[PDB]
Design a protein around this ligand. Structure first.
Ligand code: CLA
Ligand code: CLA
Ligand code: CLA
Ligand code: CLA
Ligand code: CLA
Ligand code: CLA
Ligand SMILES: CCCCCCCCCCCCCCCCCC(=O)OC[C@H](CO[C@@H]1O[C@H](CO)[C@H](O)[C@H](O)[C@H]1O)OC(=O)CCCCCCCCCCCCCCCCC
Ligand SMILES: CCCCCCCCCCCCCCCCCC(=O)OC[C@H](CO[C@@H]1O[C@H](CO)[C@H](O)[C@H](O)[C@H]1O)OC(=O)CCCCCCCCCCCCCCCCC
Ligand SMILES: CCCCCCCCCCCCCCCCCC(=O)O[C@@H](COC(=O)CCCCCCCCCCCCCCC)COP(=O)(O)OC[C@H](O)CO
Ligand SMILES: CC1=C(/C=C/C(C)=C/C=C/C(C)=C\C=C\C=C(C)\C=C\C=C(C)\C=C\C2=C(C)CCCC2(C)C)C(C)(C)CCC1
Ligand code: SF4
Ligand code: SF4
Lengths: 83, 42, 153, 73, 143, 81, 68
C-alpha cells in the first residue's frame, strides 16, 4: 500500500501568476484599494492553509518550499566555502 | 514575455533595479571623486 | 578668519591630525612586506589621505581650534561651495524627483484602476516623464502662475 | 551646540505637533467625526474602521509626554 | 400573542466529564443562565467553557455563567446542527426570566409588535455639542 | 447603569448589526424610512458588553448604531465570576 | 405627471455632510428612491473606499450639491 503516488503535470509553469500579485487568495487578488493590501500581500504569502482547503496542494507547496530552503542553504554553504 | 516584463515592472523589482543603479553610480562617483566636503568647481 | 577660525591650509592642528593619521597608517604598514597586496592597499590609503588633506587645505575651508574644518552656512561668498551651491544642486534634483512623481501620478489619475499603475509601474510613461523634470523650475513656476500647481478642492 | 540645538528644535516641533494634533482633532476627525461625544479620555472606538487605538486627545497627551521627556533629557 | 415556554427543571443534561470553566460563586449570589434545546440525534458538540460534551437525544439543558456563553453555544447549534434553542436567566431566589427570543422570532428578522428603544430621528452628526449639555445630567446622545 | 446603544435614522435596514451581537442587545423592528422597511433597536442594553461588533458591521458613511461606554456592571464587564 | 425627485442618475454630486468620509468629495448618483417616506434616497457611489472599505452611501436632498 506504501507506493509512489504521484500525479503528472498538476501546475503549469508560467509567468502569468508572476504578473498578478496576491494570486493565491481571493480577497487580495482583486487589487489594492488601500496601502494595507501591500502588507497583507506579505502576510498571507506562505499561509497555504488559508489559500486552499485541500491538504494535497498544501503538502505539495510545503515540499517545494522545503526544497527551496534547502537550495538557499546549499547556496549559503557554497558561499562560505568560496569565501 | 509580456507577463515577465509585467513582473519586472512590479514595485520591488523595479525599486531594486533603480536603487542598485543609483547606488552603483554613487559608489563610482565616490571612487572617482573621493572625500568631497565642498563644491569647488565654481 | 570668520568666527575666529584659521584656514585649514594655515592650521598647525590640521597638519598634526594628518601626521597622526599617517603615523597610524605606517604602523599598520610595518607588519607586511612592501610588495604584498595589503601593503599596496595601505599605501593607496595613505596617498588618498594626503590628497584629502591637501584638497581640504586648498579648498578654502576654515579649520577650528581642534584641527577640523568648519562649514559656514551664513551665506558668505567665500564659502558658497560648502552649503549654498550643493544646496541648490540638491534642490534641483529633489524638485526633479518630485515633479516626475507628480507628473506620473497626474497621468495615471484618470484611469479605470489607477492603483494597478502604482503597484506595477508602467515603465514607458515613466521613462517618457523622467526628463520632464530637467526643466522643473520653469514648469513649476508657470503652473503656479496659471493656478495649476494647487487644487482648490 | 548647533547640532544639539537643532535636535532641541526637532523635539519642540514634534511635541508641539502631537499636542496640536490632539487639540485640533479632539472634537473629531474623518475616522471619528463624533469624538466630542465620547469625552476627553476614552480608550478607543473598537477594532472597526481598521482599528482605533489611541484615538482620543488624552492619548495624544500620553504620547507627547514621552517626546517632552526626551526633549528635556 | 406569543407566550414564553416555561422552564422544565427535569430536563436531562448533556454527557460531560467535568471542567473547571463552569459555574462559580457568581451563580450562587447572583444570576446564572440556562440554555435548553432539542437534539434530534445523539451527537458531540464543543462546550463554550472548554472541552467537548455529548448531547443526548431529545431535550437538553445546560447551565452556564454568562449570557454570552449561552448565545455563542446557541449560535453554534443553529449554524452547525440546526437546533432551536432558548435560554433563560435564573436568580438565587428561583425567578426565571425568558431571555433570548423576546417574541418567539429571532431578532435578526423583522417581526411586528416590537417597540423602538434608543431610536434617534437624526443623523449621527446632528448631535448637540457638550457645551450645550453642561451642568445638566442629560448626555448629547440621550437627547 | 449600562452602555448606551443608540440607533439613528441613517440605518439602511441590513440586519448585520443584529447578527453581530454576542449578547442579544439589538433587534429588528418595522419602519418606513428606508427600502428595507425596518430599523434596528436596542431594548436590552443592560446586557451590552461594549464589544462594538455591531458598529464594526454597519455599512453607512458613519455608524447608524453607536455604542457609548458608560457605567459598568458585572454583566457589562464580562465577568463570569 | 409627477416628475422624479432628486438628481438624475449618473450625475456628479457634492456631499456636504460633516460626518461623512467624502465630505468635500464628489460622487456619482446611481439611484434615487421615489418613496416620499425614504429619508435618504440619493444613492451615491464614490471612487475611493472609506475606512470600512465601502464606496457607496445614501444621502438626503439637503446633503447633496450639484456641480458643473
Ligand atoms: C533514505 C532516503 C531518504 C532520505 C535521505 C531523505 C532525506 C530528506 N528528506 Mg525524506 N522521505 C523519504 C526518504 C528519504 N528522505 C521517503 C521515502 C519519504 C516519503 C514517505 C520522505 C518524505 C519527506 C518529506 C515529505 C520531506 C522530506 C524531507 C527530507 C529532507 C529533510 C532533512 C534535511 O533536509 O536534512 C539535510 C539532508 C541532506 C541534504 C543530506 C543529503 C540527502 C540527499 C540530498 C537527498 C537525496 C534523497 C532522496 C530521498 C533520494 C533521491 C531520489 C532520486 C529520484 C533522485 C532530507 C533531504 C523534507 C524536505 O526538506 O524536503 C525537501 C520534506 O519536506 N522527506
Ligand atoms: C526561505 C526561502 C523562501 C522560499 C523557499 C519561498 C518560497 C515560495 N514563495 Mg515566499 N517569501 C519569502 C521567502 C521564501 N519564499 C520572503 C522573505 C518573502 C517576503 C515577505 C516572501 C513572499 C512571497 C510572496 C509575496 C509570494 C511568495 C511565493 C512563494 C512561492 C514561489 C515559487 C516560485 O515560483 O519561485 C520560483 C523562484 C525562482 C526560479 C527564482 C526567484 C528569483 C514559494 C512557496 C508566491 C506564492 O504564490 O506563494 C504561494 C508569492 O506570491 N513568497
Ligand atoms: C550566502 C550568501 C553570500 C554572501 C552574503 C556573500 C557575501 C559577499 N560576497 Mg560572496 N559568494 C557567494 C555567496 C555569498 N557571498 C557565492 C555562492 C559565490 C560563488 C559565485 C561567491 C563569490 C564571491 C565573489 C567572486 C565575490 C564575492 C564578494 C562578496 C561581497 C559582496 C560584493 C558584491 O557582491 O557586491 C556587488 C553586487 C551586485 C548587485 C552586482 C551584480 C551581481 C549579481 C546581481 C549577483 C547575482 C549574479 C550571479 C560580500 C562579502 C566579493 C568580494 O568579497 O570581493 C572582495 C567578490 O568579488 N563573493
Ligand atoms: C550603476 C551604474 C554604474 C556605473 C555608471 C558605473 C560606471 C563605471 N564603472 Mg562600475 N560597477 C558597477 C556599477 C556602475 N559602474 C557595478 C554594479 C559593479 C560590480 C560588477 C561595477 C564594477 C566595475 C568594475 C570592475 C570596473 C568598473 C568601471 C567603471 C567605469 C568604466 C565602465 C565606469 C566609470 C571600470 C573602471 O575601473 O574604470 C576605470 C572597471 O574596471 N565598474
Ligand atoms: C543629513 C544628510 C547628510 C548629508 C547632507 C551628508 C553629506 C555628505 N556626505 Mg554623509 N552620511 C550620512 C548623512 C549625510 N551626509 C549618513 C546617514 C551616512 C551613513 C549611511 C553618511 C555617510 C557618508 C559617507 C560614507 C560618505 C559621506 C560623504 C558625504 C559628502 C558627499 C558625498 C559625495 O562625495 O558626493 C559627490 C556628489 C554627488 C554624488 C552629486 C550627484 C549629483 C548627480 C550626479 C547629478 C548631477 C546633476 C546633473 C557630504 C559631506 C562622503 C565624504 O567623503 O564625506 C566628506 C562619503 O564618503 N557620508
Ligand atoms: C538670520 C538669518 C540669516 C539669513 C536668512 C541670511 C540670509 C542670507 N545671507 Mg546673511 N548673515 C547672517 C544672517 C542671515 N543671513 C549673519 C548672522 C551673518 C554674520 C554677520 C551673515 C552674513 C552674511 C554674509 C557675509 C553674506 C550674507 C549673504 C546672505 C544671502 C545669501 C542671504 C540673503 C550673502 C550676500 O548677501 O550675498 C548674496 C553674503 O555675502 N550673509
Ligand atoms: C532555467 C532558467 C529559465 C527559467 C525560465 C524558462 C522556463 C519558464 C517558462 C517559460 O519560458 O514559458 C514560456 C513563457 C510564456 O510562453 C507562452 O506565452 C504565451 C503568450 O502568448 C502563453 O502565456 C503561454 O501559456 C506561455 O507558455 O515565456 C515567458 O514569459 C518567459 C519570459 C522569459 C523568461 C526569462 C528567464 C530568465 C529569468 C528566469 C527567472
Ligand atoms: C539594467 C538592466 C535592466 C534589465 C532590463 C530591465 C528593463 C527595465 C525594467 C522594466 C521592464 O522590464 O519592463 C519592460 C518595459 C516596459 O514594460 C511594460 O510595463 C508595463 C507595466 O504595466 C506592462 O507590463 C507592459 O506589458 C510592459 O511591456 O520595457 C520598456 O519599454 C522600458 C522602456 C525602455 C527604458 C527607457 C529608459
Ligand atoms: C515671496 C512673496 C510671495 C507672495 C505670494 C502671495 C500672493 C498671492 C498668491 C496667489 C498665487 O499663488 O497665485 C497667483 C500667482 O502667483 C503669484 O503671482 C506669486 C508668485 C510668487 C513667486 C514670485 C515672488 C517674487 C520672487 C522674487 C525673487 C495668482 O494666480 P490666480 O489666483 O490669479 O490664478 C487663478 C488661475 O488662473 C485659475 O483661475
Ligand atoms: C538664503 C539662505 C538661507 C536662508 C533661507 C531661508 C530663510 C529660506 C526661507 C524659505 C521660505 C520661508 C520658503 C517658503 C516656502 C513656502 C511655500 C508655500 C512653499 C511651497 C512649495 C511648493 C508648493 C512646492 C511644490 C513642488 C515643487 C515645485 C517641485 C517638487 C514637488 C512639489 C509638488 C512638492 C540660509 C541662511 C538658511 C543659508 C544660506 C542661504
Ligand atoms: S444599525 Fe447598522 S446594521 Fe442596523 S440597519 Fe442600521 S446600518 Fe444596518
Ligand atoms: S457593543 Fe456588542 S453587545 Fe453591545 S450592542 Fe454592539 S454588538 Fe451587541
Amino acid at each position: 500500500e506504501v507506493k509512489i503516488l504521484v500525479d503528472r503535470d498538476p501546475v503549469k509553469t508560467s509567468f502569468e501568476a508572476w504578473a498578478k500579485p496576491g494570486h493565491f487568495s481571493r480577497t487580495i487578488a482583486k487589487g489594492p484599494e488601500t496601502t494595507t493590501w501591500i502588507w497583507n500581500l506579505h502576510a498571507d504569502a506562505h499561509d497555504f492553509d488559508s489559500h486552499t482547503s485541500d491538504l494535497e496542494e498544501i503538502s505539495r507547496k510545503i515540499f517545494s518550499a522545503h526544497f527551496g530552503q534547502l537550495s538557499i542553504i546549499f547556496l549559503w554553504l557554497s558561499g562560505m566555502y568560496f569565501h | 514575455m509580456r507577463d515577465f516584463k509585467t513582473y519586472l515592472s512590479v514595485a520591488p523589482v523595479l525599486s531594486t533595479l533603480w536603487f542598485g543603479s543609483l547606488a552603483g553610480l554613487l559608489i563610482e562617483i565616490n571612487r572617482f571623486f573621493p572625500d568631497a566636503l565642498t563644491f569647488p568647481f565654481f | 578668519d570668520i568666527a575666529g577660525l584659521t584656514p585649514c591650509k594655515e592650521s598647525k592642528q590640521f597638519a598634526k591630525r594628518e601626521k597622526q593619521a599617517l603615523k597610524k597608517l605606517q604602523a599598520s604598514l610595518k607588519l607586511y612586506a612592501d610588495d604584498s597586496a595589503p601593503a599596496l592597499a595601505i599605501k593607496a590609503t595613505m596617498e588618498k589621505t594626503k590628497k584629502r588633506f591637501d584638497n581640504y587645505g586648498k579648498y578654502g575651508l576654515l579649520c577650528g581650534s581642534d584641527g577640523l574644518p568648519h562649514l559656514i552656512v551664513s551665506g558668505d561668498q567665500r564659502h558658497w561651495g560648502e552649503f549654498i551651491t550643493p544646496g541648490i544642486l540638491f534642490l534641483y534634483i529633489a524638485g526633479w524627483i518630485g515633479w516626475v512623481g507628480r507628473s506620473y501620478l497626474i497621468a495615471i489619475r484618470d484611469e479605470k484602476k489607477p492603483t494597478q499603475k502604482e503597484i506595477i509601474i508602467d515603465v514607458p510613461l515613466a521613462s517618457s516623464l523622467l526628463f520632464r523634470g530637467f526643466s522643473w523650475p520653469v514648469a513649476a513656476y508657470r503652473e503656479l502662475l496659471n493656478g495649476e500647481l494647487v487644487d482648490n478642492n | 551646540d548647533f547640532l544639539v540645538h537643532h535636535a532641541i528644535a526637532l523635539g519642540l516641533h514634534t511635541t508641539t505637533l502631537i499636542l496640536v494634533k490632539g487639540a485640533l482633532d479632539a472634537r473629531g476627525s474623518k475616522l471619528m467625526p463624533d469624538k466630542k461625544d465620547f469625552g476627553y479620555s476614552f480608550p478607543c472606538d473598537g477594532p472597526g474602521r481598521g482599528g482605533t487605538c489611541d484615538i482620543s486627545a488624552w492619548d495624544a497627551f500620553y504620547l507627547a509626554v514621552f517626546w517632552m521627556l526626551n526633549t528635556i533629557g | 400573542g406569543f407566550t414564553p415556554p416555561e422552564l422544565d427543571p427535569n430536563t436531562p443534561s448533556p454527557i460531560f466529564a467535568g471542567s473547571t470553566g463552569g459555574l462559580l460563586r457568581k451563580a450562587q449570589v447572583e444570576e446564572f443562565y440556562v440554555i435548553t434545546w432539542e437534539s434530534p440525534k445523539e451527537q458531540i458538540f464543543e462546550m463554550p467553557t472548554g472541552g467537548a460534551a455529548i448531547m443526548r437525544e431529545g431535550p437538553n439543558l445546560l447551565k452556564l455563567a454568562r449570557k454570552e456563553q449561552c448565545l455563542a453555544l446557541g449560535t453554534r447549534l443553529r449554524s452547525k446542527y440546526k437546533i432551536k434553542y432558548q435560554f433563560y436567566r435564573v436568580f438565587p431566589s428561583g425567578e426565571v426570566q425568558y431571555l433570548h427570543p423576546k417574541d418567539g422570532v429571532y431578532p435578526e428578522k423583522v417581526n411586528p409588535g416590537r417597540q423602538g428603544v434608543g431610536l434617534n430621528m437624526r443623523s449621527i452628526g446632528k448631535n448637540v455639542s457638550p457645551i450645550e449639555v453642561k451642568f445638566t445630567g442629560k448626555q448629547p446622545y440621550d437627547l | 447603569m449600562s452602555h448606551s446603544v443608540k440607533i439613528y435614522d441613517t440605518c439602511i435596514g441590513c440586519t448585520q448589526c443584529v447578527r453581530a451581537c454576542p449578547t442579544d442587545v439589538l433587534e429588528m423592528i418595522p419602519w418606513d424610512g428606508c427600502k428595507a422597511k425596518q430599523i434596528a433597536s436596542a431594548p436590552r442594553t443592560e446586557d451590552c458588553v461594549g464589544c462594538k461588533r455591531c458598529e464594526s458591521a454597519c455599512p453607512t458613511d458613519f455608524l447608524s448604531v453607536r455604542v457609548y461606554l458608560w457605567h459598568e456592571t458585572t454583566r457589562s464587564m464580562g465577568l463570569g465570576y | 405627471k409627477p416628475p422624479p425627485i432628486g438628481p438624475k442618475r449618473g450625475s456628479k454630486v457634492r456631499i456636504m455632510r460633516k460626518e461623512s468620509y467624502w465630505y468635500k468629495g464628489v460622487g456619482s448618483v446611481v439611484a434615487v428612491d421615489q418613496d416620499p417616506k425614504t429619508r435618504y434616497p440619493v444613492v451615491v457611489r464614490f471612487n475611493k473606499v472609506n475606512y470600512a472599505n465601502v464606496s457607496t452611501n445614501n444621502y438626503a436632498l439637503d446633503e447633496i450639491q450639484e456641480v458643473a
